[PDB]
Amino acid sequence: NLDIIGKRIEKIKQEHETSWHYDQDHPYKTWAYHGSYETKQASSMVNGVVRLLTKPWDIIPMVTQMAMTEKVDTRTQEPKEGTKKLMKITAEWLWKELGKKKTPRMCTREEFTRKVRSNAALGAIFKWKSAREAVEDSGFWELVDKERNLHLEGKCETCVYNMMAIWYMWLGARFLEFEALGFLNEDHWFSRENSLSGVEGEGLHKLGYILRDVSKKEGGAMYADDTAGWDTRITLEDLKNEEMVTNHMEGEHKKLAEAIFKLTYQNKVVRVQRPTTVMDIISRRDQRGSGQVVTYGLNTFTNMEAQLIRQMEGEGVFKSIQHLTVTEEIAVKNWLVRVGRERLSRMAISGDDCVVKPLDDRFASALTALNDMGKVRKDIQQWEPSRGWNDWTQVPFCSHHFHELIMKDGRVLVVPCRNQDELIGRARISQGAGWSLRETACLGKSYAQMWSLMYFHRRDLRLAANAICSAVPSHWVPTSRTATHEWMTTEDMLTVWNRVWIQENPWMEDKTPVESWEEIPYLGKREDQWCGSLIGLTSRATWAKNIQTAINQVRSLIGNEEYTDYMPSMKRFR
The binding site comprises 147, 151, 156, 159, 226-227, 229-231, 299, 352-353, 378, 401, 403, 417, 531
CB 205 within 8 A of CB 269: no
- For residue 570, state whether it binds ligand WLJ (rule: CB under 6 A): no
Residue of the chain from 432, 513, 524, 536 that contacts ligand WLJ (CB under 6 A): 536
Q: Choose from ligand WLJ, Zn ion, Cl ion, none: what does 394 bind? Cβ within 5-8 Å by kind.
A: Cl ion
Question: CA–CA separation, 387 vs 80, rounded Å?
Answer: 26
**Interacting span for Zn ion (CB under 5 A) from 81-89, 144-152, 309-317, 439-447:** 144-152
- Residues flagged as binding site for Zn(2+): 147, 151, 156, 159, 401, 403, 417, 531
**CB distance 425 to 56 below 8 Å:** no
* CB atoms near residue 267 (< 10 Å): 21
Name which of residues 474 to 533 contact ligand WLJ (CB under 6 A): 525
Residue 159 makes contact with Zn ion by CB under 5 A: yes
Is 394 near Cl ion (CB under 5 A)?
yes
Q: Please give the distance of CA 160 from its chain centroid, rounded to a whole number.
A: 23
Report the partner that residue 531 touches, choosing among Cl ion, ligand WLJ, Zn ion, none (CB closer than 5 to 8 A by kind): Zn ion
Dist. CA 190–CA 340, nearest whole Å: 16
Q: What residues pair up with 46 in beta bridges, in sequence order? A: 429
Which amino acid does the sequence have at 305?
Answer: E
Closest to ligand WLJ by CB, 375 vs 459, is 459
> Using only C-alpha atoms, what is the Rg of the chain?
26
Alpha-carbon distance 380 to 224, whole Å? Answer: 13
343 binds ligand WLJ (CB under 6 A): no
In Å, how far are 79, 237, 326, 367 from 321, measured between CA atoms? 9, 15, 13, 11
Rounded distance, CA 467 to CA 401, Å? 26
How many angstroms separate the CA atoms of 62 and 340, rounded? 44
Minimum CB separation of residue 141 from Zn ion in Å reads 15
- Contact pick of 156, 196, 463, 500 for Zn ion (by CB under 5 A): 156
Q: What string marks each residue from 422 to 461 as x (binds ligand WLJ by CB under 6 A) or -?
A: -------------------------------------x--
Q: Is 391 a residue that touches Cl ion (CB under 5 A)?
A: yes
Looking at 455-546, list the stretches that DSSP marks H as alpha helix, in order from N- to C-terminal side: 459-471, 493-498, 525-530, 538-545
Q: How far is the CB of 482 from ligand WLJ (least distance, A)?
A: 34
Judged by CB, which is closer to ligand WLJ: 280, or 528? 528
Measured distance CA(122)–CA(464) in Å, rounded: 32
Shortest distance, CB of residue 552 to ligand WLJ, whole angstroms?
22
Q: Does 443 bind Zn ion (CB under 5 A)?
A: no
Question: Which residues, in sequence order, are CB contacts of 10 under 8 Å at separation 6+?
Answer: none
Q: Which residues bind ligand WLJ (CB under 6 A)?
A: 459, 525, 535-536
Q: Which residues bind Zn ion (CB under 5 A)?
A: 147, 156, 159, 417, 531
